[PDB]
């Protein structure tokens, strides 16, 4: 169980964003139903009042918490990958609009899942804002926890892959638009019971074998990290 508190821009904390620039759900409960509209931006998907300003090139940092800011972040059992997508806010998540900007499953060297490292990075991970058409966007951060993913939720509703999904409202101001945004995949829709990465047994299968659900990272993506950029206790 985990939620997003706010975002940083170029290492500058933008302040508490809950129900403000984040479309926050009432709680940190997982989404599990792959066909639910809840797969779009979780269970309380609606325009919230503000939208964070950025430029192409900027480093946008998501910040997750479990119960309170800079706490244990998310329970260690919840091993899994992490993705970020983007879409035009016009679409409100609907249609085939979602383009992936980032992916991190398992790191062979360090021998840690993305989530493992997110605990260590005080709940912070980042992407570099791409050169798309200025305007309003949604950035969808997605944690998949696989602690019960040896079953499918459709066949057993008290197990299955767990999605922790958070949509941030981001306004891109300065960009030259050298890589305009493509069409994307829909959510719900893009993940099924048969998609790879959705059913997987982390107790028997070695993490090295894990393949994250498609789609692939779009070519116009600029990376890419899971690491603390800010100190929240300093404020």
Ligand X SMILES: OC[C@H]1O[C@@H](O[C@H]2[C@H](O)[C@@H](O)[C@H](O[C@H]3[C@H](O)[C@@H](O)[C@H](O[C@H]4[C@H](O)[C@@H](O)[C@H](O)O[C@@H]4CO)O[C@@H]3CO)O[C@@H]2CO)[C@H](O)[C@@H](O)[C@@H]1O
Ligand Y SMILES: *[C@@H]1O[C@H](CO)[C@@H](O)[C@H](O)[C@H]1NC(C)=O
66 binds, among ligand X, ligand Y, Cu ion, none (CB under 5 to 8 A by kind): ligand X
In whole angstroms, give the CA distance from residue 88 to residue 92. 7
State yes or no: residue 1 binds Cu ion (CB under 5 A).
yes
# binding residues, Cu ion (CB under 5 A): 1
Which range binds ligand Y by CB under 6 A, 32-40, 69-77, 189-197, 208-216?
A: 32-40
CB 98 within 8 A of CB 165: no
State yes or no: residue 156 binds ligand X (CB under 6 A).
no
* Binding residue (CB under 6 A) for ligand Y from 19, 28, 36, 120: 36
Which range binds ligand Y by CB under 6 A, 30-38, 43-51, 116-124, 138-146?
A: 30-38
Contacts of 42 (CB under 8 A, 6+ apart): 23, 25, 31, 165, 166, 167
Q: Is 162 annotated as a binding residue?
A: yes
State yes or no: residue 155 binds ligand Y (CB under 6 A).
no
Q: By rule CB under 6 A, what string of x and - marks binding of each residue 60-79 to ligand X?
A: ------xx-------x-x--
Q: CB of 66: closest distance to ligand X in angstroms? A: 5
Q: Is 164 annotated as a binding residue?
A: yes
* CB closest to ligand Y, residue no: 33
CB nearer to ligand X: pick between 194 and 204: 204
CA angle centred on 108, ends 104 and 114, rounded to 5°? 30
In whole angstroms, give the CA distance from residue 174 to residue 133. 9
Distance of CA 134 to the CA centre of its chain: 22
State yes or no: residue 33 binds ligand Y (CB under 6 A).
yes
**DSSP SS3 for 82:** strand
CB 136 within 8 A of CB 171: yes
Which range binds ligand Y by CB under 6 A, 29-37, 84-92, 115-123, 162-170?
A: 29-37
CB 213 within 8 A of CB 199: no
Q: CB of 34: closest distance to ligand Y in angstroms? A: 8
CB nearer to ligand Y: pick between 15 and 37: 37
Q: Which of 49, 25, 73 is nearest to 171 (CA)?
A: 49
In whole angstroms, give the CA distance from residue 75 to residue 13. 24
Q: Is 1 annotated as a binding residue?
A: yes
CB 28 within 8 A of CB 2: yes
Interaction site with ligand Y (CB under 6 A):
33, 35-36, 157
Residues that bind ligand X (CB under 6 A): 1, 28, 66-67, 75, 77, 147-148
């Amino acid at each position: 169980h985990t939620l997003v508190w706010g975002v940083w821009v170029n290492g500058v904390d933008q302040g508490d964003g809950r129900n403000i620039y984040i479309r926050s759900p009432p709680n940190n409960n997982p989404v599990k139903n792959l066909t639910s509209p809840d797969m779009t931006c979780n269970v309380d998907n609606r325009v919230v009042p503000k939208s964070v300003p950025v430029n192409a090139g900027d480093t946008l940092t998501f910040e997750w918490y479990h119960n309170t800011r800079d706490d244990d972040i998310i329970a260690s059992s919840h091993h899994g990958p992490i993705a970020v997508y983007i879409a035009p806010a016009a679409s409100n998540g609907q249609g085939n609009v979602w383009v992936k900007l980032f992916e991190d499953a398992y790191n062979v060297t360090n021998s840690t899942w993305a989530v493992d490292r997110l605990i260590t990075a005080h709940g912070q991970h980042s992407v570099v804002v791409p050169h798309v058409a200025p305007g309003d966007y949604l950035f969808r951060a997605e944690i998949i926890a696989l602690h019960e993913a040896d079953s499918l939720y459709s066949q057993n509703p008290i197990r299955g892959a767990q999605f922790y999904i958070s949509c941030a409202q981001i306004t891109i101001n300065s960009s030259d638009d050298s890589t305009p945004l493509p069409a994307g995949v829909p959510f719900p829709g893009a993940y099924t019971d048969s998609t790879p990465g959705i059913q997987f047994n982390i107790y028997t299968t070695p993490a090295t074998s894990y393949v994250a659900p498609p789609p692939s990272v779009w070519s116009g993506a600029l990376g890419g990290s899971i690491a603390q950029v800010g100190d929240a206790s300093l404020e």
